[PDB]
Structure 1
C-alpha cells in the first residue's frame, strides 16, 4: 500500500529541474540588470527570485521525496545565450517564465487527483499558491516600466518594494 506514483515522481523531478534552471537564468538576469541596464534594485529583485527557485522551491521536492519513496534526479542543462534588449523586456521575460510555472503546476495537481495521490495534491498546494504570488510580485514591477520613462524613478520604487517587510496575504502569502 502507499506506493509512490511514478508519474508524480517524474513531474516533480521535472519541476525540480525547472526551478534550478530558472534560478540560474535569474542570476544572470540579475547581473545584467545592474551591469548593463544600470538597474541595481531590479537586480536585487531578480536575485531574490533566483534564490527562491534554487532554494525553497527545490528544497521541498527533495524533502517530500525523502518521505514517500520517490527518487530524486539531478539532470541540469542551461545556457544563457541571448539576453533581452532592455530592462522592461527582462522583467517581461521573467513574467512569462512565471506564467509557465503556473501551467506546469496545474498539471501536477490534475495528475494527483487522477492518481489519487492526495498527499501529492496537498504538497502542490504550496506551489499553486506561490505561482500566483510570484507572478503578482513580478507584475508589480512590470507595471512600473509602463508607468514611467525614468529609470531612476522605477529604481526607487523597486527599492521600496524590496525593503518592505514581507507581510503575507492570508490566502496567497
Structure 2
C-alpha cells in the first residue's frame, strides 16, 4: 500500500467529516434564521452525504488494502454567511475545492501505479461533479427570482 495515497485519503476522510459538520450547521441556519426549510433540507442531505458514504467508503477501502485509518477532526463554525444566497454560495465554494482534492488523489494514484486507488477514486470524481451540479442548480435560483418563497417551492421539487 502507498503511504502517500494513505495520507491523501486520510485527509479526504477528514475533509468530508469536517465539511459534513459545517453543512449540518448551515442547514440549521437556513431553516431557523433564513426561513428556508427546504434549502435547509437540501444542505442537510449534503451533510449526511459527506458524513455517510463519503467517509465510510474510505474506511472500508482501507480495510481491504491494508491502509490505516486516522481520526483527527477539528472544526468550529465561527461566522455564518449573512443571507441565504451567500450561504449556498459558500457551500458551492467548498464543493468546488473538493473537486481539486479529488483530482490530486487521482493524479497521485496514477503516479504510484496504484490502479486499485485510481479505480476507487472514480466514484468521487463523478460524485464531485454532480454534488457541485446540484449545489449550482440551487445557487441559480437566487439569481432567477427575488422571492424566497418562490425559490423555496422550486427547491422542494429539486429534492
More helix by share: 2
2:69 to 68, 72, 94: 72
Aligned partners of 1:9 and 1:132: how far apart in 2? Answer: 23
Question: Residues 1-173 of structure 1: matches in 2 within 5 Å?
Answer: 4-162=1-159
DSSP 3-state at the match of 1:125 = helix
Please, what is the CA RMSD of the aligned residues?
0.3
Aligned partners of 1:125 and 1:23: how far apart in 2? Answer: 21
DSSP 3-state at the match of 2:73 = strand
What is the CA deviation profile of residues 106-144 of structure 1, one whole-angstrom value per residue up to 9, with x for unaligned ones? 000000000000000000000000010000000000000
DSSP 3-state at the match of 1:72 = coil
Aligned partners of 2:56 and 2:143: how far apart in 1? Answer: 35
Aligned partners of 1:55 and 1:35: how far apart in 2? Answer: 24
Unmatched tracts of structure 2, length 5 or more: none
How far 1:160 sits from its partner (Å)?
A: 0.9
Aligned partners of 2:156 and 2:108: how far apart in 1? Answer: 40
> What TM-score do the two structures reach when normalised by structure 1?
0.92
Aligned partners of 1:73 and 1:18: how far apart in 2? Answer: 12
- How many residues in Structure 1 have an aligned counterpart in Structure 2? 159
How far 1:28 sits from its partner (Å)?
A: 0.2
